[PDB]
């Protein structure tokens, strides 16, 4: 996260770290959506251009964390993966369209002050809140600058950007399964996700029911925190029918 701040304890209790077993390293963010299900970006698990194709046994998820590098004894919980599910129309060849994946845990994680699921949006919450100017919140342990790494989880609040501005900022083809967020050059505030934050959540706090909803997944950006560029996020509501199908079937 670029130009963010240290999270408060328990501020993002749905935060998940995707952790490579060997070498032991941070791979991506993710989020807890139930006691057995974790949501992330497909490209965190499958990206053939970089020879990335993880299997369940390659990975662990670490839940309830605050410190990036410490083993947070009596606080974090470490879970093994039963099965990975990648959206069948995830477009890794072109533009990361439908950049979404689910991971089912081998056993349920116990909730605590530090471990608690985020809500997924309904159509009405999405329609009300996914509007240009409305701010969401991005969290992660990724790099602090494009070109360095944080002691603890970082947080930044960023405004959703008008779709024509998103499209006009890039040569990549933007789809309805993406939205973008970040400040414009003229706005005099900054911030973005960066490498290591992808797969983590973009959340909004509904003013109707005071609950946090995951509206986006950190998906891609051209660099980090560049003037005139924006971060792109998977549109969670648009893909919720797939989410529901996977959880209902499996």
């Amino acid at each position: 996260i670029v130009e963010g701040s240290d999270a408060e304890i328990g501020m993002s209790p749905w935060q998940v770290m995707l952790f490579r077993k060997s070498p032991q390293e941070l791979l991506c963010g993710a989020s807890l959506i139930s006691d057995r299900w974790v949501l992330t970006a497909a490209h965190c698990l499958l990206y053939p251009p970089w020879d990335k194709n993880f299997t369940e046994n390659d990975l662990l998820v670490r839940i309830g964390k605050h410190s990036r590098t410490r083993y947070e004894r009596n606080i974090e919980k470490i879970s093994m993966l039963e099965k990975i599910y990648i959206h069948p129309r995830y477009n890794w060849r072109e533009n990361l369209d439908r950049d979404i994946a689910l991971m089912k845990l081998k056993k349920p994680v116990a909730f605590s002050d530090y471990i608690h699921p985020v809500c997924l949006p309904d159509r009405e919450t999405a329609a009300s809140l996914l509007q240009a100017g409305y701010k969401g919140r991005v969290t992660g342990w990724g790099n602090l600058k494009e070109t360095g790494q944080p002691s603890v989880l970082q947080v930044v609040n960023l405004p959703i950007v008008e779709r024509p501005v998103c499209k006009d900022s890039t040569r990549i083809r933007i789809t309805d399964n993406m939205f973008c967020a970040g400040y414009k050059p003229d706005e005099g505030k900054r911030g973005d996700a960066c490498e290591g934050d992808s797969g983590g959540p973009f959340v909004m706090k509904s003013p109707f029911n005071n609950r946090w909803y995951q509206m986006g997944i950190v998906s891609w950006g051209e660099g980090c925190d560049r003037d005139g560029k924006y971060g792109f996020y998977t549109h969670v509501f648009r893909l919720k029918k797939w989410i529901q199908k996977v959880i209902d079937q499996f």
């Binding site: 032991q24 390293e25 590098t69 083993y71």
Partner: peptide, 11 residues
């Protein structure tokens, strides 16, 4: 530099 995690999670 990540602190080693308990071996139980790697078995």
């Amino acid at each position: 530099d990540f602190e080693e995690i308990p071996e139980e999670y790697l078995q």
